[PDB]
Paper text:
Langerin, a C-type lectin on Langerhans cells, mediates carbohydrate-dependent uptake of pathogens in the first step of antigen presentation to the adaptive immune system. The extracellular portion of langerin contains a C-type carbohydrate recognition domain (CRD)2 that binds sugars and a neck region that mediates formation of trimers stabilized by a coiled-coil of α-helices. As in other C-type lectins, the CRD of langerin contains a primary Ca2+-dependent sugar-binding site where Ca2+ forms direct coordination bonds with two vicinal hydroxyl groups of a monosaccharide. Langerin binds to a diverse set of glycan ligands including high mannose structures, β-glucans, and fucosylated blood group antigens.
To investigate the structural basis for the reduced binding of mannose-containing structures to the Asp-288/Ile-313 variant, the structure of this form of the CRD in complex with α-Me-Man was determined. The interactions of mannose with the principal Ca2+ through the 3- and 4-OH groups, as well as the additional interaction of the 2-OH group with the side chain of Lys-299, are the same as those observed for the wild type CRD. Residue 288 is much closer to the principal Ca2+ site. However, the electrostatic interactions would be significantly different with aspartic acid at position 288 because this side chain forms a salt bridge with the amino group of Lys-257, which in turn forms part of a water-mediated hydrogen bond network with the side chain of Asp-308. Interactions with both backbone and side chain oxygen atoms of Asp-308 form a key part of the Ca2+-binding site. Thus, subtle differences in the hydrogen-bonding pattern resulting from the change of asparagine to aspartic acid at this position, could account for the reduced affinity for Ca2+, which in turn leads to an overall reduction in affinity for sugars. Under the usual screening conditions of 2 mm CaCl2, the signals are lower, although the pattern of ligands bound is similar, with most significant binding to the GlcNAc-terminated ligands (data not shown).
Numbering used by the authors: 198 to 325
Amino acid sequence: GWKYFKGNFYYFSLIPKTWYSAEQFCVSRNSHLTSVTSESEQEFLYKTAGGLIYWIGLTKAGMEGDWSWVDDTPFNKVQSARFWIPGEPNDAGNNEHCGNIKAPSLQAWNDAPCDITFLFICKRPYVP
Ligand SMILES: CO[C@H]1O[C@H](CO)[C@@H](O)[C@H](O)[C@@H]1O
Ligand SMILES: [Ca+2]
């Protein structure tokens, strides 16, 4: 039940997991929690999400707490500013170190506590 979009397959989970347990599940399926690197990808993801919240590959790295992609796609702070929900990341309780797709819009991302369970999206490259 993987959905194909532009050289990648995506898995929209039916079971909710914590950010890391979801990531482990993806890694066990030769994938990672999805990065988002274009407007068309963001749009594909939030429309497929159908108004439900899904963990994606957003998580903090380094001492400064910069956001990063768990699949090691370099995080482009400038080019991703448009993808956050207005007001996010707000870091609530000083404990929101992972990211999900929340709002059904281009401005979709929210930071949430990593140990909260949500549905999740894996991303797997297609290699011909
Ligand atoms: C109540 O907290 C929730 O809503 C705020 C926005 O008000 C988000 O930033 C936060 O991560 C939670 O999802
Ligand atoms: Ca938040």
